[PDB]
RNA sequence: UUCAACCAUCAAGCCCUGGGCUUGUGUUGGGGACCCGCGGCUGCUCGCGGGCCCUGAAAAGCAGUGGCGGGCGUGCCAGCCG
């Protein structure tokens, strides 16, 4: 995959979404986020995975103040909320805005207009590996139908009977919390379902060519390294467009066969 | 291989029968039942639908 | 706003009857 | 007269117990305990009651011995939400093989009165006594399997039947699932 | 005499066609029933109509159990006419709805093998694709030289 | 009328009412004791220690037999486990004193002789098997004399090991009890010739073998090192078969 | 028979709206005198 | 027993210098007492009102319906001033109801007064307007049908 | 003639000393515009999966695809696979 092509597209692609914006006008150009569509040639996973896989961007996506953020946790909720009043530097203190456990997350949002209020108060879900199996009951399809605000993994775990919540959170050092927490809000996510097509995000349309070339190559190139099966002979398209621009190739492929034994005569 | 022979329980009940500690009386294994006459409830007979 | 909420708040159009002025 | 409640309790029962069961089967993977079966939910699927129908278990309040092999351990997994079991101690044993010990001879039951029984029955494997079952049971011997096959599965009671009040009550409730370990001395003891 | 048919609404997940049959035959004989089901899951839209032998007994069970609460939801029981009854409403009744899997479908369909004649067509197909996509490309002030396929 | 109020409150729906009540009633399912206390019957039916030890006899044969039956509804399994241990507390103070004087093995059990203060105390203990209760005999009444020979016997235990200046009760390990300790449960503190004929042996007792009297023979007649197998129980003085320290081996076997 | 159907239906109603609790034992009193009975003193 | 331990516990907070705000939070209990429940109807908030059907005498609550209706406050009458009493820990209960309940119980609570809504107050609109009694002896009845089946076929 | 709760509030396996990686399948139903990728359809379109909004746990025919076993060729399976 030539970058050349890659940053020919991204001014391309820019400078389309600027003229049909002009067509406030700042406004409506920012908060356009930009979609990389992968095509395989084969279905990415044999089943409806609902734990988005992050990847790690040079450039971190969510940066702006204006976001929510919304963290999950195991019982006690207490802990974290002291924690989050005491512990986190200023930025991530006003960023997060609800901490809520999951015993008190299933009792006051079993409810669909509950989860649909919650979905609606804020933008990103951050969730702890202990309780994320049972978070797709938890919050329905109101949360997983799209994948636009899928709960990110994140491992809040102490890592080495029932435990008492009260008397121990098994709690793991809070400045690497800090740090998780970080990294989770800047990673990109991917989502792993049964189809051909899958798409992950790079960038919004205020950002500059250059950085957003540079991650589109790397999340294409961890993509099809760690999470795409049977790699580069898998990978059959790759794409670049905006909710309203058509598609923008990068790299289209020779071939459109996984492997020389599906050639039958 | 011995075979313990009789029962202790039943020779301990004869010993306090022979004694006179109590006095023999059999098992009554079922009990006279109060006559009685079901009949159904005033709610459940205006009960109309 | 919450429509359990709105259900659960929701009177008649009469004013309240107020016996004295409440502290 | 049935509910439509109880229907659909009912349905969301079993599909819970399918998925629960699925989820066994999709993730497969020597002591001694001892098996009780309490009260569950009223219908059973095949699986479950064809283990309960192996393990002997099928009436409440029934006791047995199963020495925990890769097999049994994946059977009382599956049959997990209808038996509580643990690792009962040399006092359990010897009390329930003592006081509620009953022999299967010619497919009936006869207590355990003497050795005798033992010796014609169990002597060709060189189990001859009441004290050698004990040894076996507990020890887990080469003929573990002959002499729980020997044992009648014992038939615990029901303290609260003693207390007027709370007379039709279950002793044990069920939710507590999984492995109680030293905990089910406790119930033997209280219902033994 | 009169068939009976009953629409029923808000049903709660687990309250579906033999829980209907059960429940619904302590009132009386049900000789058809289909509950309302999606074709891509196989769930079902929580809404049925049952038609009993007898409109007496269905409009006796429809003012019993119109306005159930049942597991959080208000029951809908209405009975409908025999002027307006659809004829159409009871083909796939009695019988269990399948759930068909048309993702292991198309999985199965994309990776099963073909003829190379099949695949000549698919090459040709897949590059009039990309001169639809390139010319739709010329107005974007976009260009991209895409190799061409090679023929097996 | 506690058990009216109880039934109310449950029927009410207050738990912790109910429990809070039940509580009061000193059930015997939960205190291993007779639901009702018979402390100062005891004193009017016997006036005298001499009468109590007369009918030691009938108290004794009655606990040792309602030692070994599973539970009822008339008497729970800590009211048997009460009566057993007050069996063993009985036998810890002949085997301190050694006051057993006769042992016999008839058809039907063990006869024990002992002389305690004077008084010849002859009492049948059933072998260790599975007894068989049946329907001939009135299992309540057996109870409710199971329940007054209980409370004679607490107090009769009681002077037997204050007059021999011994605290009482004795301290009993629940660890090695629930290990099959039986008799080697308990361990004898102070408070604040035939009796030796056992003294210089060392013996070992196999599984076949009657544990509970053949220990009991031994210990009350001078024994001091006794050994059997893991399965007999925990508490004896060795378990391997090859110790060289063994004197004397009791075995059963063709 | 139809009113037999109809019964049926009646009852199943009666038992969704009521419960199935719908009956209660009555003394049989071969006697007609009513006597005080007799409590605890 | 629990207002014992709450009274303890806001009795060492005011010991080490704290508010009985700040160790006990906001109680959410069912309302009860006719007086009460009357004067929140009132005041409209009470936001569900349960009456006892057999209230002797009955003029205490004969115009608990109407009130309702002119304050616009969902009510159902319910059977059993005993059972009333049982959720409020009494042996009598006239009257019952719910202002506030808990956001994890708003859902539930606006589900039941919809059902109430739905099936009691729309089944009883116009059976409430009617006569009660006049129900014949069952001797009275068969000597009436039996005249007027006579009368028919004279 | 209980509408309760009950998944992992963490386990197992890699790297071999860094605290990182893999698996543990777990979603109410509809409606409205609208940018798409892929598979059939001569093609329209029909499916698969994505994107943007709305909703009381809302509802008024439009039922659609190849089979293993089981039940009496089958508008039968509280049994499954493709």
């Given at each position: 995959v030539d970058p050349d092509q890659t940053l020919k597209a991204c001014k391309a692609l820019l400078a389309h979404i600027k003229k049909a914006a002009a067509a406030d006008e700042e406004s409506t150009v920012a908060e356009t986020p930009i979609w990389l569509t992968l095509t395989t040639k084969k279905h990415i996973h044999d089943s409806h995975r609902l734990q988005p896989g992050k990847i790690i961007l040079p450039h971190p996506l969510n940066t702006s103040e204006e976001i929510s953020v919304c963290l999950i946790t195991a019982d006690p909720q207490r802990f974290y909320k002291n924690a989050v009043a005491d512990e986190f530097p200023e930025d991530l203190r006003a960023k997060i805005g609800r901490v809520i456990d999951i015993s008190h997350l299933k009792a006051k949002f079993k409810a669909y207009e509950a989860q649909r209020k919650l979905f609606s108060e804020h933008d990103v879900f951050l969730a702890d590996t202990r309780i994320i199996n049972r978070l797709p009951k938890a919050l329905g399809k109101t949360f997983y139908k799209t994948t636009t605000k899928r709960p990110i993994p994140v491992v809040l775990m102490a890592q080495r009977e029932k435990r008492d919540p009260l008397e121990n959170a098994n709690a793991r050092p809070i400045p690497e919390i800090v740090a998780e927490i970080r990294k989770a809000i800047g990673a990109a996510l991917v989502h792993l379902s049964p189809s051909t097509n899958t798409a992950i995000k790079v960038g919004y349309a205020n950002w500059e060519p250059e950085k957003l070339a540079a991650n589109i190559e790397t999340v294409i190139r961890e993509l099809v390294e760690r999470f795409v099966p049977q790699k580069w002979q898998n990978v059959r398209n790759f794409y670049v467009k905006g909710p309203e621009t058509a598609a923008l190739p990068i790299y289209q492929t020779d071939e459109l066969w996984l492997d020389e034994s599906k050639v039958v005569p | 291989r011995l075979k313990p022979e009789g029962n202790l329980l039943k020779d301990r009940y004869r010993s306090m029968i022979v004694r006179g500690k109590l006095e023999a009386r059999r098992k009554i294994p079922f009990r006279k039942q109060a006559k009685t006459k079901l009949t159904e409830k005033w709610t459940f007979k205006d009960f109309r639908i | 706003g919450l429509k359990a909420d709105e259900i659960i708040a929701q009177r008649s159009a009469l004013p309240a009857v107020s016996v004295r002025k409440r502290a | 007269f049935k509910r439509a409640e109880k229907y659909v309790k009912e349905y969301r029962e079993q599909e819970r117990e399918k998925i629960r069961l699925a989820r066994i089967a999709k993730q497969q993977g020597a002591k001694l305990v001892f098996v009780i079966r309490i009260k569950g939910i009223n219908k059973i699927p095949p699986k479950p009651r064809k283990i309960l129908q192996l393990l002997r278990l099928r009436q409440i309040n029934n006791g047995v011995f199963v020495k925990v092999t890769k097999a049994t351990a994946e059977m009382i997994k599956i049959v997990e939400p209808w038996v509580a079991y643990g690792y009962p101690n040399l006092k359990s044993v010897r009390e329930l093989i003592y006081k509620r010990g009953y022999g299967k001879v010619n497919g009936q039951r006869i207590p355990l009165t003497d050795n005798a029984i033992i010796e014609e029955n169990l002597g060709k494997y060189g189990i001859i006594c009441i004290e050698d079952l004990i040894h076996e049971i507990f020890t887990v011997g080469p003929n573990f399997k002959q002499a729980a096959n020997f044992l009648w599965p014992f038939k615990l009671s029901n303290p609260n039947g003693g207390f007027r009040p709370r007379k039709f009550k279950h002793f044990i409730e069920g939710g507590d699932l999984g492995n109680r370990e030293e905990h089910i001395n406790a119930l033997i003891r209280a219902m033994n | 005499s009169q068939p009976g048919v009953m629409y029923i609404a808000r049903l709660p997940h687990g309250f579906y066609e033999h829980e209907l049959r059960g429940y619904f035959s302590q009132f009386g004989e049900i000789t058809r029933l289909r509950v309302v089901r999606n074709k891509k899951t196989g769930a079902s839209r929580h809404r049925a109509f049952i038609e009993f032998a007898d409109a007496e007994v269905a409009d006796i069970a429809a003012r019993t159990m119109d306005k159930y609460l049942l597991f959080g939801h208000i029951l809908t029981c209405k009975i409908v006419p025999p002027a307006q009854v659809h004829p159409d409403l009871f083909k796939g009744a009695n019988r269990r709805f399948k759930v068909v899997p048309w993702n292991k479908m198309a999985g199965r369909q994309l990776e099963r093998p073909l003829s190379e004649s099949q695949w000549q067509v698919k090459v040709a197909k897949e590059e009039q694709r990309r001169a639809a996509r390139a010319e739709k490309l010329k107005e974007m002030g976009y260009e991209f030289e895409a190799p061409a396929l090679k023929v097996p | 009328?506690?058990?009216?109020?109880?039934?109310?409150?449950?029927?009410?729906?207050?738990?912790?009412?109910?429990?809070?009540?039940?509580?009061?009633?000193?059930?015997?399912?939960?205190?291993?004791?007779?639901?009702?206390?018979?402390?100062?019957?005891?004193?009017?039916?016997?006036?005298?220690?001499?009468?109590?030890?007369?009918?030691?006899?009938?108290?004794?044969?009655?606990?040792?037999?309602?030692?070994?039956?599973?539970?009822?509804?008339?008497?729970?399994?800590?009211?048997?486990?009460?009566?057993?241990?007050?069996?063993?507390?009985?036998?810890?103070?002949?085997?301190?004193?050694?006051?057993?004087?006769?042992?016999?093995?008839?058809?039907?059990?063990?006869?024990?002789?002992?002389?305690?203060?004077?008084?010849?105390?002859?009492?049948?203990?059933?072998?260790?098997?599975?007894?068989?209760?049946?329907?001939?005999?009135?299992?309540?009444?057996?109870?409710?004399?199971?329940?007054?020979?209980?409370?004679?016997?607490?107090?009769?235990?009681?002077?037997?090991?204050?007059?021999?200046?011994?605290?009482?009760?004795?301290?009993?390990?629940?660890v090695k009890d629930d290990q099959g300790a039986e008799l080697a449960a308990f361990s004898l503190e102070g408070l604040n010739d035939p009796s030796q004929l056992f003294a210089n042996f060392t013996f070992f007792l196999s599984r076949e073998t009657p544990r509970q009297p053949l220990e009991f023979i031994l210990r009350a007649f001078g024994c001091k090192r006794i050994g059997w197998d893991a399965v007999l129980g925990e508490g004896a003085f060795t378990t391997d078969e090859s110790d060289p320290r063994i004197t004397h081996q009791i075995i059963d076997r063709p | 028979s139809k009113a037999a159907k109809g019964a049926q239906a009646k009852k199943a109603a009666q038992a969704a709206l009521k419960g199935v609790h719908s009956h209660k034992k009555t003394k049989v009193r071969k006697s007609t005198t009513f006597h005080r009975p007799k409590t605890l003193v | 027993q629990e207002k014992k331990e709450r009274l303890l516990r806001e009795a060492t907070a005011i010991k080490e210098g704290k508010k009985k705000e700040d160790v006990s939070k906001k109680p959410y209990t069912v309302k009860y007492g006719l007086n009460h429940v009357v004067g929140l109807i009132e005041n409209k908030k009470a936001s569900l009102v349960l009456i006892a059907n057999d209230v002797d005498p009955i003029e205490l609550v004969v115009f608990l319906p109407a009130l309702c209706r002119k304050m616009g406050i969902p009510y159902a009458i319910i059977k059993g001033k005993a059972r009333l009493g049982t959720l409020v820990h009494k042996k009598t209960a006239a009257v019952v109801a719910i202002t506030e309940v808990r956001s994890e119980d708003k859902n539930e609570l606006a589900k039941l007064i919809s059902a109430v809504k739905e099936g009691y107050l729309e089944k009883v609109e116009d059976t409430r307007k009617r006569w009660g009694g006049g129900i014949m002896g069952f001797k009275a009845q068969k000597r009436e049908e039996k005249r007027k089946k006579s009368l028919e076929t004279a």
């Open positions: - | - | - | - | - | 009328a506690l058990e009216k109020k109880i039934s109310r409150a449950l029927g009410r729906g207050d738990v912790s009412n109910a429990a809070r009540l039940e509580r009061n009633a000193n059930l015997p399912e939960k205190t291993g004791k007779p639901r009702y206390t018979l402390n100062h019957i005891i004193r009017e039916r016997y006036p005298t220690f001499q009468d109590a030890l007369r009918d030691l006899d009938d108290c004794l044969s009655m606990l040792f037999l309602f030692a070994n039956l599973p539970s009822t509804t008339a008497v729970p399994a800590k009211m048997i486990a009460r009566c057993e241990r007050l069996c063993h507390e009985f036998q810890h103070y002949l085997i301190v004193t050694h006051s057993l004087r006769k042992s016999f093995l008839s058809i039907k059990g063990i006869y024990y002789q002992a002389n305690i203060q004077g008084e010849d105390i002859l009492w049948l203990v059933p072998y260790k098997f599975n007894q068989r209760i049946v329907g001939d005999v009135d299992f309540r009444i057996m109870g409710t004399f199971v329940e007054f020979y209980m409370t004679l016997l607490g107090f009769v235990n009681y002077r037997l090991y204050t007059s021999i200046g011994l605290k009482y009760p004795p301290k009993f390990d629940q | - | -």
